[PDB]
């Protein structure tokens, strides 16, 4: 056992905070989440990439220092995912002084282990997405002001000749080794074509890294290389050491970096369990990271999960904006994370209208969830307010029961691919299931007709919720608690995989207080 250490990317800080810097740390968070409500140590992390010419010229267009436009922005970025109400345990910034010091050590490493000689690149570069690109891998675009330019095929952003003097990483001598990584552990990289990409592009060959820049064409805006001082390290090189970094900072109560040990064993948390990341930036972590971590002797992440890019109304995220947390405030920050962890797979299909977020509130959140806490809940139902003690079981209660306690373990295997939209979507089935239990039981009419009758249907129904809604507690961490506290399920059955088996709470167990306007989720005008 050790701490499962799960990350996000660390973000370039060239401008402001938005929905796919807060949907990766979303997922981050998630995971993170799921794992402490099973009683393991967690160690979650997200930060901010702050070096490199991209971030120093975005600086210079704002015309303000490089300290302290990056300072400001990464400021935006720790507002942003505190207003998020995540519960990531650090927030790393690549101009921290200790993660500098590991990069050093890391670089230090990779010389003495002879993988890295001065050569040169020439050859295209795209400032904006800070890589290489073959020519194969470029083609004619319009520059800021229309002129004609070369672009990259990946993403569009304007690339440039670039023909320097520079440290070489000895990236092909790895092709075998990866090779081998990829095919003992065919799960480490998620979804499968992301996956089968990666090794397609590997089988190729690889071509020697450039890992570090002439000193001017950084705007000195960079990590020194040890030993040469016109030099510096390639901004990818020092942002995937954030992981390395991370993984080795003892962190006070407030959140401060108070100590930066001398071996990552020390806290238990490398390798990383779950790399997030966006598809954008694939190869930096399944080939470039894994390819420096073997030359360095260090272990190699678990699993690597890489997330598609997104669109509002089927267009490009100008004159089209989604501010989450103006969406969160209009719609609700558990309700916007559910839309967001549900409505999108591994793809660029989702469907981020008002309207489908709306539709996905009304009919799953209140018709589905909702209305089933309120049902078991009502005095008009659970007559004593409290959990009852069951009576014989039905063959269809059976079945129903059969489904929660199976729910766990299904809603766990998807949890640890990881695919977040394949639990949800299975936490829902089961929510549906106990609908139509319930419908067809009709409760209210056995409160007259029946009571013993009520008392199997009722504790049935109250223990579907809770057990659906523990799983549901990583997606929708305050609702849940709100959902907890009508139920009147102790703390101590909030969490824990003790707590994840069918009749954890025994009858008795008295509900919470009824508040006058109660309303879990509030339906919206179709509009
Ligand atoms: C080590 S993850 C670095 C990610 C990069 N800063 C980006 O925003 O795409």
């Not at 972590?285 to 992440?301: C, E, K, M, N, R």
């Not at 109304?313 to 549900?342: C, H, Q, S, T």
């Not at 109250?462 to 961490?477: D, F, Y």
């Amino acid at each position: 056992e050790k701490v499962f250490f799960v990350t996000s990317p660390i973000y370039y800080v060239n401008a402001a905070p938005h929905i796919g810097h807060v949907y990766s740390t979303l997922i981050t968070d998630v995971i993170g989440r799921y794992h402490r409500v099973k009683g393991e140590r967690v160690f979650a992390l997200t930060g901010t990439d702050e070096h490199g010419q991209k971030v120093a010229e975005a600086a210079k267009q704002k015309q303000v220092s490089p300290y302290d436009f990056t300072t400001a922005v990464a400021g935006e970025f720790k507002k942003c995912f505190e207003q998020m109400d995540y519960s990531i345990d650090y927030f790393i910034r690549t101009t921290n002084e200790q993660h500098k010091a590991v990069v050093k050590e890391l670089w230090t490493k990779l010389e003495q282990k002879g993988d890295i000689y001065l050569g040169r690149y020439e050859g295209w570069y795209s400032i904006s997405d800070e890589s290489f690109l073959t020519p194969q891998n470029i083609t004619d675009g319009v520059d800021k002001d229309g002129n004609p330019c070369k672009v990259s095929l990946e993403s569009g952003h304007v690339v440039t000749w670039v023909s320097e003097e520079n440290y070489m990483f000895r990236l092909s001598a790895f092709r075998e080794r990866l090779l081998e990584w990829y095919h003992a552990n065919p799960g480490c990289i998620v979804p499968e074509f992301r996956r089968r990409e990666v090794i397609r592009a590997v089988e190729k060959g690889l071509p020697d890294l450039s890992v570090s820049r002439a000193r001017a064409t950084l705007h000195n805006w960079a990590i020194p290389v040890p030993g040469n001082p016109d030099h510096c390290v390639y901004v990818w090189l020092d942002a995937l050491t954030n992981y390395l970094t991370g993984s080795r900072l003892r962190v006070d109560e407030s959140g401060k970096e108070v100590s930066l040990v001398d071996d990552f064993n020390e806290l238990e948390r490398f390798p990383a369990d779950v790399h997030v990341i966006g598809k954008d930036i694939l190869k930096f972590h399944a080939i470039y990271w894994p390819a420096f971590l073997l030359s360095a002797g260090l272990p190699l992440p678990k699993k690597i999960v890489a997330h598609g890019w997104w669109t509002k109304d089927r267009k490009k995220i100008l004159g089209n904006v989604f501010d989450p947390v103006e969406k969160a405030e209009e719609f609700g920050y558990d309700a916007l994370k559910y839309f967001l962890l549900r409505e999108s797979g591994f793809s660029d299909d989702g469907d981020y209208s008002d309207k489908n977020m709306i539709a996905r509130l009304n009919g799953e959140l209140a018709d589905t969830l909702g209305n089933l806490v309120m049902r078991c809940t009502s005095a008009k139902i659970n007559v004593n307010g409290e959990w009852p003690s069951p009576a014989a079981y039905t063959e269809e209660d059976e079945s129903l029961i059969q489904l929660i306690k199976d729910l766990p373990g299904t809603a766990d295997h998807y949890y640890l691919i990881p695919d977040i939209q394949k639990a949800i979507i299975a936490v829902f089935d089961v929510l549906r299931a106990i609908n139509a239990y319930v419908t067809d039981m009709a409760p209210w009419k056995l409160v007259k007709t029946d009571p013993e009758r009520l008392r199997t249907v009722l504790y049935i129904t109250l223990e579907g919720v809770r057990v659906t809604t523990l799983l549901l507690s990583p997606i929708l961490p305050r609702k849940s608690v709100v959902i907890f506290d009508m139920l009147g399920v102790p703390e101590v059955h909030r969490k824990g995989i003790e707590n994840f088996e069918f009749g954890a709470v025994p009858p008795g167990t008295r509900l919470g207080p009824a508040v006058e306007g109660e309303v879990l989720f509030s339906k919206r005008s179709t509009e």
